[PDB]
Design a binder for this molecule. Structure first.
Ligand SMILES: [Zn+2]
Lengths: 139, 473, 843
């Protein structure tokens, strides 16, 4: 009962430390905010379905976000970079359960958002280069 | 001063040195506070007024400080020190026997303005007490409680209780060496801690602490363990006792050591930093007695001696080092000896409770490291510690920014999910089944809305039976 | 090849860093750190397999530059750069251990400032804070570099040339540029002492420094002065006071023309106002090591000249505030009077009172008709506080400009001041601001009381009229004073021998309270609470007092045990500076002096003067070996001389003072107890320790110890030096390693290894409790007691707090804190100290 609500806190704290989201200087030299990731990665091994689904919505929200300015673009670029890198580690980290019954998330939630980057994405000559490189490893 | 400069009396040169030190002591800022004239540079000036012939005095500032019956003991024993020095020289003096008689007359007579002060003094000076006297004192406490709940005037009779307890703390070391009440005054102390008032709690420990010290000097714990002695004398009046345990939410038949510790844990919430160290000493003295019964080096871990080590964990360094967490001598939480489901459900509630109200970095660090390690070594019983840990961890996860304190909490979350996927064998209400449903409640802070918990209607009957059984007449 | 090349790389890179600032400098440093880590391991493993590890000149010529570049980064503006640089001192230290494991032989000889460097490490491991806060900690540690070194004396000079040139750019040109200038100055002040020792680089620093306090520069002039005042006061190295004062004095002396006429000038007035702020902060702060250096210089002549200039300044809102501050300086100068040095204390205190009474003028703000001059009220309030402090214990002495009977002169002098105070007292009456008058009136009576006590003979007659004064509060005070005057004896009269002896008899009992199981809470607590500045006074008093009580053994066991148990390096800390350490120094010096001189003296006559010895060189160095003298002759003579000294030391076991005998036993028990918790011999460490610190120093330089009036000839001096090395080796049972020069002598030491053990054991064999050895001298020790009571009164409150924290198990009513407050109040405030005719002197 409670522990499910404990995981939400670890996930929820993840959103509020994405650069595009107000930084609020909670990084505490990034040691505090980095530790949270390691927990989020570790929890996925036993609640894979829950964690992955939560991550997708965080990515989906970031995509449907409009911001203008040199600061604006840089924040979102670094924002999506962390999500993808974390997301790949969860997949790789997960033991070879080889459970092929994840269709629900893949068909609708996940594939459309990963596929979006693979397009040319000519917004940034240097940024889009990394996103495709990072996203492809996920796929 | 008149004593030091009197010719009728012939004090040797030894005595006169005692007096002169007393003369200096009374003029220190310590005694200005006791008399209640602190913030007064010199007493003489205030006592006299220059323009006392021309105009009448003009009092003001009706705001008036309070008095504490503990202050009266300190003064009342300073005077008693002076008087005895004199009686050494004066042969066949009658001073002390005349003063006692005056106190004994107001002590046992109803007067709500003089009775409390005449009890704190009757005991501090008296040299002999008989069974007939003790019964009256303990029956002034029984009527004091009854008035409190009946009427709306509380503070009036909340000092006649604190004064009865302070007297008993002084009159016991004079009792006969073979009297039952030497042991039945362990339940008076316990029945007073249950009233949830900072003064009543403070006075209750002082009776408890000396109750152990006296029984040792009588060599009563030589061949028996605390549980055996106090639980043997409670048997004749078990019927009234049983009902109290139901409402306070602790049981003494199920597990003695834990019930006794349960009450003392509230001491950690006392505003005065002098009552905090007194409850720690009472724990050591209890720890050194249970192990001595088993000849176990005073720091061995067993079923009996595990409750007092969780309480001493965060205050006593020798306890922490000699009982160390395995995943950094023997290590607390051993599953070889702590192989009983009950004896390991309670030991977790004590640890969870100590952090629910604590607010200190050094304490939260030490207590959580023992809770992570508990999460793994005791997977099955740990789900009985969620609601206690539920709220505070949830806040810590969101806002905490300390690597030292943020590590163990994460270890707790990971363990919970891992050992999930099974139908909970033990629910949160596992403790209410066998009595200790109130253990976490009894250690809360002292209520600002001072009121008798209203289950004092039973403490009266318990006391009444206690008199009837051991003081027939 | 590794050290040939790897070391040569460092020499190239380090020399680049020092030369000038580069953008990536803070990065090369992080890389330079790991190189040091990575060449310790190769030395560590290399030494393990085969010590044989070579140290060619390049290894030295490149070790220097590494240090010369690690100091100059401490004042670097970048916070990260300085923190990293501090951490790089460990790897400079840890290399010392590997090359030579034994601490004393090399760890304090190859790397003289070994102990301080370890402190840099701890400060680095702290939370980041602004450059100012960090600079405070850096400059503290930079001030404790005791030993001159090539790295120090060249880090100081190299950064001086940079400092000099940088200054010109700032001034000549008609914020980040300035901040660097501040950092270089502070560094170059805290670390001044090392380069100390006519025209010199250090001296030129001061002159330029003083020539900036008056720097009038429209652009940035204000900020320069605000910081030079701030540094020279709160940051100068205590090793430079004797030079600051002398230059500070000479600058003033030329403000006065011939015939002593002040030459007012606007800059001259700005210079004095600065010399007051510098002196006040300099004197106000009590720091470690400052006291010993205040003594050298004479601050009198500067102080007198300072007032005259302020005396003639005139009256105005500006000049009045200067008068105020100077008066407050004279108050602080009279709280340190015991530390300072005075050629003529009395003749100087009288003039100041003469010069200060003129400024206390009341009711001058009403005639002035301006409330803007209400400050003049503050000047009178400030002036009196100075006169109170000046007068406390001051006999009067009239200037002999005219010849009259001395007694007649004084009585006239006394009445001069008495009426002055009386007149100011009448005005302050409320009937004739309430807080101002209350304080001023209070002061004016305390000032009068101090005047009478010192001069009862010449001033009682003039003073009786205060009995019937018109102010009731004032009549009580005059009566209290005379109560003392009667109670104090007129002559010696053996009146303190009876009254004071009995009155203060109980005091020692409280201090000597035998805490259960040797706790001694008063002494132990008094140790920590007392500020480190007075550790000299505290050490002497405790040792002297306990000896009188025949309980010296008890104090040592308690004091040493905490230090030794706390730090397993028992021997190292004792030689270091600390309260426990200083106890040893007093013990050896006070009792050892007689023992050493009596023993060594007869031998010194033989070698120095006897014609039989004639002229011979006690040298075995082949490089210095003279062909004229045969090596065999020198070797045999030197060995023969050593036997003479060695035999005398062993024979004179009985003459050892009992005090040290007790001292050795406590250390023996401490190490023996230390061994138990941990084939090391306790005697071996004790014997080497005692010999190295007590016997060895006298032999090397007997003249400095005072054994010999005339300095021994250098040729005679060499034999003593080599003698010590041979003797010291015997204690450690160490043969000559890489010491072929003295290897032939290694044969001699073998026989005497057993003999040395017997001498050490005899002293170490004294009974732990001297039940048999008894000396019930029980001397009064009147002089010492007064200081002890004086010490307690000053720290009455703070020592209580330490007692309050502990002792909860038992009520303190029968324990020190209750006893202390009762007795201490009973005795009342201590009397003022008497003046010192002699110059300032120390142990
Ligand atoms: Zn001189």
């Amino acid at each position: 009962h409670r522990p499910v609500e404990w995981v939400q806190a670890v996930v929820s704290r993840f959103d509020e430390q994405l650069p595009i989201k107000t930084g609020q200087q909670n990084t505490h030299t990034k040691v505090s905010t980095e530790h949270n990731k390691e927990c989020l990665i570790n929890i996925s091994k036993y609640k894979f379905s829950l964690v992955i689904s939560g991550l997708t919505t965080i990515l989906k929200n970031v995509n449907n976000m409009r911001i203008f300015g040199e600061a604006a673009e840089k924040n979102l670029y670094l924002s999506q970079l962390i999500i993808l890198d974390t997301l790949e580690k969860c997949l790789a980290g997960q033991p070879k359960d080889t459970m092929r019954l994840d269709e629900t998330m893949l068909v609708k939630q996940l594939l459309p958002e990963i596929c979006h980057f693979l397009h040319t994405c000519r917004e940034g000559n240097q940024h889009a280069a990394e996103l495709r490189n990072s996203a492809s490893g996920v796929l | 001063h008149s004593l030091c400069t009197c010719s009728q009396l012939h004090f040797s040169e030894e005595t006169k040195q005692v007096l002169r030190l007393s003369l200096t002591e009374f003029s220190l800022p310590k005694f200005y506070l006791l008399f209640g004239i602190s913030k007064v540079k010199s007493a003489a000036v205030i006592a006299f007024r220059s323009s006392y012939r021309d105009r009448s005095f003009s009092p003001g500032s009706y705001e008036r400080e309070t008095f504490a019956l503990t202050s009266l003991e300190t003064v009342t024993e300073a005077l008693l020190e002076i008087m005895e020095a004199c009686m050494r020289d004066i042969p066949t003096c009658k001073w002390l026997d005349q003063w006692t008689e005056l106190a004994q007359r107001f002590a046992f007579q109803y007067n709500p303005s003089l009775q409390p002060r005449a009890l704190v003094v009757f005991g501090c000076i008296s040299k002999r007490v008989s069974h007939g006297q003790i019964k009256q004192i303990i029956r002034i406490l029984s009527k004091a409680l009854e008035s409190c709940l009946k009427g709306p005037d509380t503070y009036n009779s909340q000092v006649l209780i604190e004064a009865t307890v302070i007297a008993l703390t002084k009159l016991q070391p004079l009792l006969n060496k073979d009297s039952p009440l030497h042991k039945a005054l362990f339940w008076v102390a316990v029945a007073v801690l249950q009233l949830d008032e900072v003064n009543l709690y403070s006075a209750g420990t002082a009776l408890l602490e000396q109750n152990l010290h006296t029984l040792d000097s009588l060599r009563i714990f030589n061949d028996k363990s605390p549980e055996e002695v106090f639980m043997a004398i409670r048997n004749p009046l078990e019927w009234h006792c049983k009902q109290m345990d139901h409402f306070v939410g602790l049981n003494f038949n199920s597990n003695f050591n834990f019930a006794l510790v349960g009450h003392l844990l509230k001491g950690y919430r006392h505003p005065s930093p002098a009552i905090v160290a007194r409850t720690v000493r009472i724990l050591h003295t209890l720890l050194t007695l249970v192990n001595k019964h088993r000849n176990c080096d005073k720091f061995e871990v067993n079923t009996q001696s595990v409750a007092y080590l969780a309480a001493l964990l965060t205050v006593s360094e020798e306890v922490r080092s000699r009982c160390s967490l395995k995943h950094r001598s023997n290590v607390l939480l051993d599953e070889e000896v702590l192989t009983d489901p009950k004896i390991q459900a309670l030991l977790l509630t004590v640890l969870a409770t100590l952090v629910k109200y604590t607010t200190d970095e050094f304490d939260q660090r030490i207590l959580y490291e023992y809770l992570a390690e508990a999460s793994v070594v005791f997977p099955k019983v740990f789900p009985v510690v969620h609601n206690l840990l539920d709220s505070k961890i949830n806040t810590l996860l969101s806002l905490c920014q300390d690597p030292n304190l943020l590590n163990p909490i994460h270890g707790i979350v990971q363990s919970v999910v891992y050992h999930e996927e099974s139908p909970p064998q033990y629910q949160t209400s596992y403790l209410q089944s066998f009595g200790f449903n109130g253990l976490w409640r009894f250690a809360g802070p002292f209520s600002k809305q001072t009121q008798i918990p209203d289950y004092a209607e039973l403490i009266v009957k318990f006391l009444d039976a206690l008199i009837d059984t051991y003081l027939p007449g | 090849t590794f050290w040939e090349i790897s070391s040569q790389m460092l020499f190239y890179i380090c020399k680049k860093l020092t030369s000038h600032q580069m953008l990536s400098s803070t990065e090369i440093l992080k890389w330079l750190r790991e190189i040091l880590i990575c060449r310790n391991k190769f030395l560590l493993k290399n030494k393990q397999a085969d010590r044989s590890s070579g140290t060619p000149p390049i290894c030295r010529q490149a070790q220097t530059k590494l240090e010369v570049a690690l100091y100059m980064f401490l004042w670097n503006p970048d916070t990260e750069a300085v923190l990293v640089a501090m951490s790089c001192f460990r790897h400079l230290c840890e290399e010392a251990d590997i090359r030579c494991g034994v601490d004393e032989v090399s760890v304090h000889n190859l790397l003289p400032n070994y102990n301080t460097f370890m402190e840099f490490a701890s400060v680095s491991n702290m939370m980041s804070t602004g450059r100012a806060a960090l600079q405070k900690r850096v400059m503290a540690l930079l001030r404790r570099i005791e030993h001159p070194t090539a790295g120090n004396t060249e880090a100081w000079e190299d950064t001086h040339a940079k400092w000099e040139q940088a200054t010109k750019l700032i001034l000549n040109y008609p914020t980040d540029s300035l901040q660097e200038w501040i950092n270089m100055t502070g560094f170059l002040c805290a670390l001044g002492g090392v380069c100390l020792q006519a025209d010199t680089p250090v001296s030129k620093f001061m002159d330029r420094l003083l020539s900036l306090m008056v720097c009038n520069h429209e652009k940035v002039g204000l900020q320069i002065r605000t910081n030079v005042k701030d540094l020279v006061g709160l940051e100068l190295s205590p090793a430079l006071y004797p030079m600051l004062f002398n230059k500070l004095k000479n600058t003033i002396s030329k403000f006065f023309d011939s015939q002593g006429q002040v030459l007012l000038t606007d800059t001259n007035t700005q210079f004095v106002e600065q010399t007051i702020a510098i002196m006040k902060n300099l004197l106000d702060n009590h720091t470690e090591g400052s006291s010993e250096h205040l003594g050298q210089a004479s601050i009198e002549t500067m102080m007198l000249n300072l007032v005259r200039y302020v005396r003639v300044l005139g009256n105005m809102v500006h000049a009045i505030q200067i008068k105020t501050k100077l008066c407050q300086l004279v108050e602080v100068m009279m709280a340190r009077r015991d530390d300072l040095s005075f050629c003529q204390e009395m003749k100087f205190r009288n003039k100041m009172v003469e010069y200060l009474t003129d400024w206390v003028m009341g009711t001058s703000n009403q005639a002035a008709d301006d409330d803007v001059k209400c400050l003049t009220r503050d000047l009178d309030q400030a002036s009196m506080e100075a006169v109170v402090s000046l007068l406390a214990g001051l006999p009067l002495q009239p200037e002999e400009g005219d010849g009259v009977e001395l007694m007649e002169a004084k009585s006239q002098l006394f009445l001069k001041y008495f009426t002055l105070f009386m007149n100011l007292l009448n005005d302050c009456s409320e009937v004739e601001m309430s807080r101002r008058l209350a304080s001023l009136r209070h002061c004016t009576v305390l000032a009068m009381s101090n005047l009478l006590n010192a001069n009862v003979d010449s001033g009682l007659m003039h003073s009786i009229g205060l009995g019937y004064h018109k102010d009731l509060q004032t009549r009580a005070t005059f009566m209290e004073v005379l109560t003392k005057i009667l109670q104090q004896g007129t002559e010696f009269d053996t009146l303190a021998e009876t009254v004071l002896a009995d009155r203060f008899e109980r005091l020692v009992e409280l201090v000597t309270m035998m805490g259960d199981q040797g706790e001694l809470p008063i002494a132990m607590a008094l140790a920590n609470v007392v500020p480190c500045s007075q550790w000299d006074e505290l050490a002497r008093v405790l040792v002297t007092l306990f000896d009188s009580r025949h309980l010296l053994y008890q104090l040592l066991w308690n004091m040493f045990s905490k230090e030794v148990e706390l730090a397993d390096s028992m021997q190292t800390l004792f030689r270091g500076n600390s309260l426990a350490s200083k106890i040893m120094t007093f013990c050896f010096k006070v009792y050892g002096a007689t023992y050493l001189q009596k023993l060594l003296d007869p031998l010194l006559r033989i070698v120095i003067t006897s014609s039989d010895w004639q002229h011979v060189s006690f040298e075995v160095d082949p490089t210095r070996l003279e062909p004229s003298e045969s090596l065999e002759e020198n070797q045999r003579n030197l060995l023969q001389m050593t036997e003479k000294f060695f035999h005398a030391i062993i024979s004179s076991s009985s003459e050892f003072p009992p005090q040290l005998r007790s001292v050795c036993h406590c250390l023996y028990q401490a190490t023996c107890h230390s061994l138990l918790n941990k084939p090391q011999n306790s005697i071996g460490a004790v014997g080497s320790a005692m010999f190295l610190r007590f016997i060895n120093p006298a032999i090397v330089s007997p003249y400095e110890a005072g054994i010999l009036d005339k300095k021994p000839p250098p040729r005679i001096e060499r034999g003593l030096k080599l003698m010590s090395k041979i003797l010291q080796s015997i204690a450690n049972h160490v043969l000559f390693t890489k010491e072929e020069h003295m290897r032939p002598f290694n044969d001699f030491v073998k026989s005497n290894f057993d003999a040395a053990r017997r001498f050490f054991l005899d002293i170490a064999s004294d009974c732990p409790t001297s039940d048999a050895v008894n000396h019930s001298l029980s001397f009064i020790s009147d002089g010492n007691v007064l200081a002890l009571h004086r010490l307690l009164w000053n720290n009455q409150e703070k020592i209580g707090q330490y007692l309050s924290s502990n002792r909860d198990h038992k009520a303190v009513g029968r324990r020190p804190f209750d006893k202390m407050a009762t007795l201490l109040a009973y005795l009342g405030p201590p009397e003022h100290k008497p003046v010192a005719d002699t110059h300032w002197s120390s142990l």
